[PDB]
A paper describes a structure:
Breakdown is then initiated with the conversion of the C‐3 hydroxyl group to a ketone (cholest‐4‐en‐3‐one, cholestenone) by the oxidase ChoD, and further oxidation at the C‐26 “tail” region via a three‐step process involving oxidation to the hydroxyl, aldehyde, and carboxylic acid species. These sidechain‐modifying reactions are catalysed by the cytochromes P450 CYP125A1 and CYP142A1 (CYP125 and CYP142 hereafter). Comparison of the effect of complementing a CYP125 knockout in the CDC1551 strain of Mtb (which does not express the CYP142 protein), with CYP125 or CYP142 reveals that the two enzymes are functionally redundant with respect to growth on cholesterol. Here we present a series of compounds based on an ethyl 5‐(pyridin‐4‐yl)‐1H‐indole‐2‐carboxylate pharmacophore which bind strongly to both Mtb cholesterol oxidases CYP125 and CYP142.
Examination of the overlap of the co‐crystal structures for compounds 1–3 in CYP125 show that the incorporation of a five membered ring onto the phenyl ring offers a vector for further elaboration. This led to the development of compound 4, where the pyridyl ring is fused onto the 5‐position of an indole ring. The indole ring has an ethoxycarbonyl group in the 2‐position and, along with the NH of the indole, provide vectors for further elaboration. The affinity (KD) of compound 4 was shown to be 3.0 μM (CYP125) and 0.75 μM (CYP142), an improvement in affinity in comparison to the original fragment hits. Gratifyingly, the CYP125 binding mode is preserved when these fragments are merged and modified to develop compound 4. Although compound 4 is similarly effective in bridging the hydrophobic active site regions in both CYP125 and CYP142, the observed pose is notably different. In CYP125, compound 4 extends perpendicular above the heme and the indole occupies a small pocket formed by Val267, Glu271, Trp414, and Leu415 which is not utilized by cholestenone (PDB code: 2X5 W). In both CYP125 and CYP142 the indole nitrogen in compound 4 forms solvent‐mediated polar interactions. In CYP125 this involves a water molecule coordinated between the carboxyl oxygen of Met200, and the sidechain of Glu271, and for CYP142, the interaction occurs with an acetate ion derived from the crystallisation solution. Combining information from the binding position of compound 4 in both CYP125 and CYP142 suggested that elaboration of the compound from the indole nitrogen offered opportunities to exploit the space above Trp414 and Leu415 (CYP125), or the pocket surrounded by Ile65, Asp77, and Leu72 (CYP142) to further improve affinity.
Residue numbers in the entry:
A (entry chain B): 19 to 247, 250 to 427
B (entry chain C): 19 to 427
C (entry chain A): 17 to 427
Write the structure that this text describes.
């Protein structure tokens, strides 16, 4: 039995509102790398099965991710924590997006959606995103100091979304608002916000966009998505595409930027090296270090033995990427922030398999462009005060972080 | 060979600004109960000796505290962490107060000053602190919501200091100001306040008090301390100043943080809060202090070679007593991670290890705790927190700067 | 005068030449008929440089004049290596500006001053006894094998142990230090087609920055403490600067000294009277005649920062000049009988370590001591060695390398 407090729950949002439980994950890797995480009645964050298998080793994460035929995303979704009193109906709605589907449905959507994440679609946004990154960093440097999350981390990921969807500048303000309103709904700072209403607004805007583009086809992703190659996103599916993209492409990359800069602030030797060399390998080490998604879950569709543990049909497994990305048997000096690290087989974008992050290259470009812009415009920036973390059971978020850009 | 990241330092203020390193402390207790905590050059929080011995077990904490003739408070003081660039002299000025003295100097001062903190002397403040506690809780309940630290935790410990000293009401504002000016000095929120200057202010005021009481003796505490006793012993004028400084500092943040973290414990354990409201048990104060452990760690310096639980402590080496670890020692408490306000016996070391330096204010602190929680139970029994607390950056103090709570619930 | 008698399109940096031979007669033809000569290069055939060609510098006095006028002849503008793979990306040339070799003043001046703390005569002399011990063991191990690859069993190890000893690299880490060092060069030869110098450099820098951090806490007697402790003016190598220093060393003092050893013994095998004299007298002047004969760095380049007239030839701003040390070290106007291998040659003003000036090899005396120590050990343990077959040369446009050389140590 691992040396943990009685009743300890790795999906407890109260933990992540304070800290990442690095030491507790290290104890699991050392003493029980696949450990049953029991959950008292009504304290399962919306699931009522008594607990889940905590997965803490990178190889087990990869095994679960590659065996999607067995470990299902559709069955219970991939988010392993909601409000304890959430309604099952409000969990199953997740199934309307590609992330929480199984083959064959998922296979079909994935193939169509790939049209929007080709090296062309991504690479074409480089010049505008580079321009926007440089302006953002310039604006922050002129301000002298402020909330790094709002002034440096937030905009560029959202502009990458808008650019990819070809959203007109006039509607980006409201688009960004709706996207943000579906973030951090479990944290008291946002407890007054109705995310269901914002999702309905996004779906609506997405439909006008798809209908408008059907009548006026152009050389851009949305038209490629509603156009038939005879496979094409249905009007509805395109709305759920936008919702999923407005959500998946926002907080995760944002939080990679905040926590990457926190890493640089704590390891100035790495910041001095970065500013000189600008290594393209930095983005992956920032994603490994930041692990913006702490965990996604799966559900066993049949009995499966994983590293000597008998997982039973119907049981949940929770893949703790935050643990796996510091696996002492995979990484040399996992607790060293090393922007030259290469190869870097982290699972911050998930394990290799059917659901691997389709936006990983877009995320890497966003990260490299903003940090290049930070190095260009505020090379001497230093933190003012401690970051404020997000209350979430599965997202690793930084809400606010005060920084002095002039140093 | 504990399972810790390379370079981990248990006195690193950056840790405590975020969290209490509970799991890391537990790993030491399990795999290396006495462990050399190496510190790089220039990262010893004012000390330049390569590191210190981490003490994580309760019996070890007590053995060190009982053997004060070996483990000195004077050689390097008891605070284990300052700003890295602190001058040595600024560390050595600590020795002017009882806490950082060794026998025989300490023995005499403790004998004289203890007269002001007896059960009787403490009991004298009960009524005025009870009335104040009730008013504090009423005024907070009426505000509906706010920062629990400021509205409930901060004032009553300061009024206990002023009451013990007999400070006129008109002077309490500036007394509280200088007392707080010597707090939160390693945290960016209060990085712009000078401790040494304020200590001079406190000392100057104490001189005016001693000078006045020599002219108009009264039946209070300042007069007793400046009056020769039956054995011809008394605090000198300088000694009285450092007593006020010691009191103004020692009676403030620690009790404040026991109240804040006691209420946090109650909020995370609603069954215990219901029991407290119904029963108001006399064991709750000690369990609150065990859970809060407001002083995370105090240090000693070995005056000679000493073998401690099979480890060889060499002369000149520092040992750091981590009360935060000892108070959750699984061998002493069967269920340390249970918050049990009926815990009895409760051999916690929140007030230190028994010995020559055991907190003389423990009875005063327990009364302050009991009075304010009785008042909270009376006036806002349904309070619940709004947002997460904001912790204090410090290498040895366990502090909560702010905590928003809905008193009405 | 007439044009030099060279094949049309001949390129003195062509790696395909050096994989087979040293172009000795071609260099001699330039010295006689066109001592400063425009080496044209066809589109896409410039080894990473796309400017139409360069000036071939073949006379020792011209090499010295360029090396001394570093204010005009820049190392930083295009780096000093004159040949990479034809398709190398410009960004992969410019990243090499982070080592001291490819820096101009004032950045070069500061770094060299700091680095000098690690190459004092005292620091290098402190390595004499350990390197002597290891040389004798190397030669004894080789002789006990009876026959084998002289490059691998005699030439390779001592230069790497010199680097390791200078830096104070623990014994358990020397294996990977040596691996990283060997992965830095040769990538144009089919034998090394799979090496990744970018990756090697990154792993070395990461290792080196960790060592810098560790050795700040516990200072040792190596040069690392000297390099990373600030002086009065606060001058010291940063951790990443120490990393680029280690990269520079792992490169600059590995294959160069190795190839001096291999070609020194190649020369002794062709000149047995010199070998008999060496065994008898053990003259340390041999090390400099060996470096002159071996010229392990065939050529380094510079770039003109302004128009400059050099021995009657108008060099134009922006043009590259390539200093062919291999030609200058056989310059008939400086050396008496340059094509005689003479281990007593004295004075021996060769430019195998470069021309005097700002970038002159800081490791020259460590190199000479390594050479004298290994050849004493070879003389002591295999005085009768004899080659079995012909050396295999390295495909490089600027390094004069021997990959393999089979020899019978017992004779
Ligand atoms: C650092 C930034 C990001 C991180 C850490 C991240 C993380 C992840 C993870 C862990 C998964 C699921 C892995 C699995 O279950 O196998 C995933 C999938 C996904 N990601 Fe990301 N992501 C990032 C950026 C983005 C961006 C920028 C986009 C869109 C612009 C995006 C869109 C998606 C989508 C649509 C999926 C579902 C794929 C599927 O179900 O087939 N992500 N991402
Ligand atoms: C919850 C509240 C408090 C806590 C957690 C606490 C904690 C401690 C601890 C752990 C020590 C041990 C010193 C050592 O062994 O090195 C100590 C000593 C001391 N405390 Fe407290 N204390 C509290 C309240 C107070 C109050 C209210 C006062 C005075 C009004 C006070 C005055 C002192 C003094 C003077 C000493 C030094 C005694 C000596 O050196 O003989 N403390 N305290
Ligand atoms: C026979 C062996 C060697 C040869 C033929 C050689 C050759 C050279 C040459 C030609 C230069 C450039 C000089 C110039 O541009 O003026 C140089 C520079 C350099 N060498 Fe050596 N070298 C040898 C051994 C070593 C060793 C053993 C070390 C150190 C362990 C070393 C370290 C360096 C460094 C750091 C530079 C750069 C100096 C600067 O740019 O200021 N070399 N070497
Ligand atoms: C109920 C649905 O709404 C959410 O609760 C929510 C889903 C979600 C997904 C990501 C994500 C997924 C894959 N790749 C990157 C990011 C991020 C935040 C999310 N929130
Ligand atoms: O800075 C400071 O010199 C400082 C000293 C100090 C002492 C206490 C204390 C000691 C014993 N008992 C209760 C409280 C608390 C805060 C303190 N700060
Ligand atoms: C840490 C950043 O990475 C580098 O320091 C780096 C080294 C390096 C070497 C070459 C190279 C050298 C010789 N021959 C061909 C290529 C190219 C790029 C490089 N980058
Ligand atoms: Cl000092
Ligand atoms: Cl108990
Ligand atoms: Cl340039
Ligand atoms: Cl000569």
């Amino acid at each position: 039995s691992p040396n943990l407090p009685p009743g300890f729950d790795f999906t407890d949002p109260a933990i992540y509102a304070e800290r990442l439980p690095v030491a507790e994950f290290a104890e699991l890797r050392s003493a029980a790398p696949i450990w049953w995480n029991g959950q008292d009645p009504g304290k399962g964050g919306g699931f009522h099965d008594g607990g889940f298998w905590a997965i803490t080793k990178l190889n087990d994460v990869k095994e679960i991710s590659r065996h999607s035929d067995v470990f299902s995303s559709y069955e219970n979704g991939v988010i392993p924590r909601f409000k304890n009193d959430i309604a099952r109906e409000d969990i199953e709605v997740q199934r309307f997006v590609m992330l929480n589907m199984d083959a064959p449905h998922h296979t079909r959507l994935r193939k169509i959606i790939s049209r929007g994440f080709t090296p062309r679609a991504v690479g074409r946004l480089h010049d505008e995103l580079q321009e926007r990154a440089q302006k953002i960093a310039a604006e922050a440097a002129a301000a002298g100091s402020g909330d790094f999350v709002e002034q440096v981390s937030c905009e560029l990921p959202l502009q990458a979304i808008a650019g990819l969807l070809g959203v007109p500048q006039e509607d980006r303000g409201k688009l960004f608002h709706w996207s943000n309103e579906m973030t951090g709904n479990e944290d008291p700072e946002y407890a007054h916000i109705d995310p269901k209403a914002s999702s309905a607004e996004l779906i609506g805007y997405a439909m006008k966009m798809a209908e408008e583009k059907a009548k006026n086809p152009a050389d851009d992703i949305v038209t490629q998505l509603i156009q038939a190659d005879g496979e094409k996103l249905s009007d509805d599916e395109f709305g759920f595409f936008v919702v999923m993209l407005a959500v998946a492409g926002n907080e995760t990359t944002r939080n990679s930027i905040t926590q990457g800069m926190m890493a640089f602030a704590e390891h100035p030797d790495q910041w001095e090296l970065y500013k000189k060399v600008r290594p393209e390998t930095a983005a992956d080490e920032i994603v490994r270090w930041a692990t913006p998604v702490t965990a996604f879950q799966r559900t066993a569709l049949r009995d499966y033995e994983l590293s000597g543990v008998q997982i039973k049909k119907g049981q949940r497994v929770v893949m703790f990427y935050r643990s796996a990305n510091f696996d002492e048997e995979v990484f040399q000096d996992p607790f060293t922030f090393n922007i030259l690290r290469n190869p870097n087989p982290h699972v911050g974008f998930g394990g290799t398999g059917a659901h691997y992050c389709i936006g990983a290259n877009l995320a890497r470009m966003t990260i490299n462009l903003i940090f290049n812009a930070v190095a260009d415009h505020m090379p001497d920036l230093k933190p003012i005060s401690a970051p404020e973390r997000l209350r979430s059971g599965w997202l690793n978020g930084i809400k606010h972080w005060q920084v002095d850009y002039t140093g």
